[PDB]
Amino acid sequence: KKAKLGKSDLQVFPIGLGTNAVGGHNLYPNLNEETGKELVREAIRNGVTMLDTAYIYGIGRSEELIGEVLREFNREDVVIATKAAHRKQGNDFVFDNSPDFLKKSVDESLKRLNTDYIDLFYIHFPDEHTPKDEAVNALNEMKKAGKIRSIGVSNFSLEQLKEANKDGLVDVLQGEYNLLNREAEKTFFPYTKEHNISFIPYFPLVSGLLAGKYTEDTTFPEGDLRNEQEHFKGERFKENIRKVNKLAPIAEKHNVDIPHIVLAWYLARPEIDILIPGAKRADQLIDNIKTADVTLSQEDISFIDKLFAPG
Ligand code: NA
């Protein structure tokens, strides 16, 4: 019912909620803000502990909406993770990890969330010129003052992570990882496991491909982002569909669906304590809570590992 996130003292239910569809108007068209608030409220009512947001989600709006729902509950019963790096420049953004920028971003995030502390604060993307250990040290000043309780980094290369953890202050790393892109096992995993840094994957279901939602005849409307990715093209796509479908007997056996088996396999890794699947509505997040009750056998884990062995 509760996992400890690496070196941090954060205790959380193993399925968290990603909030980029709660007020993220710069990312999605036609979003309903009350639908987003009900998603956050129902996640908390159903036992999800961690809410993962970011400044770029709606350019502050996701954090403001989450903050409004937070008023309805007890602050200490929830774990809030948020992130910063995007800095407005012209009509887009550039990344900034400078000490003063990160500290000011933490202050502005607390105001949007309308709360006095953040549980986990991430450097969302690495900038080019700031030495990463100084960027992390700036967040540690906020940790010392009680404004944040843990520090994370995301989208950092292994060398950037080592510089950032120079003094051992990084508690969590968010990075791309899934059954079709398992490169993190060779690079990051040995390092995060050794240092007790919690690893949270992003893109765990490959835009639905690993959820067994498509067939080899599936096509997507023009302009659809899936059409651009190689996992979704030619014979590779058909090969991907055939392997995912071989997961159906394991899902039937555990009385869940294919995505629940894939997400449970990530949680069985010693390096991973929590998953943050996304959702647009309360009902979709509730379907992903089922994942937590799955107990894969060692034979299930080994079979999936070999079935999805790197090509
Ligand atoms: Na684990």
Curated annotation (Swiss-Prot):
One of its GO terms (molecular function) is oxidoreductase activity. Keywords: NADP, Oxidoreductase. The record marks K83 as: Lowers pKa of active site Tyr. Its EC number is 1.1.1.-. Disruption phenotype: Disruption of this gene affects neither growth on inositol nor the inducibility and catabolite repression of Idh synthesis. The active site is at Y57. Monomer. It holds the Pfam family Aldo_ket_red. InterPro entries: AKR, AKR_Detox_Biosynth, Aldo/ket_reductase_CS, NADP_OxRdtase_dom, NADP_OxRdtase_dom_sf. NADP(+) binds at S154, N155, Q174, Y202, F203, P204, L205, V206, S207, K213. Induction: Induced by inositol. Repressed by glucose. Is cotranscribed with iolR, the repressor of the iol operon. Belongs to the aldo/keto reductase family. Aldo/keto reductase 11 subfamily. In vitro, is able to reduce the standard aldo-keto reductase (AKR) substrates DL-glyceraldehyde, D-erythrose and methylglyoxal in the presence of NADPH, albeit with poor efficiency. Shows only trace activity with benzaldehyde and butyraldehyde. Is unable to oxidize myo-inositol with either NADP(+) or NAD(+) as a cosubstrate and also does not use glucose, 2-pyridine carboxyaldehyde, fructose, xylose and succinyl semialdehyde as a substrate. The physiological function of this enzyme is not clear. Does not seem to be necessary for inositol catabolism. GO terms for cellular component: cytosol. This is Aldo-keto reductase IolS. It is an enzyme of class 1 (oxidoreductase). The 3D-structure shows a unique architecture for an AKR active site, which may explain the low catalytic power.
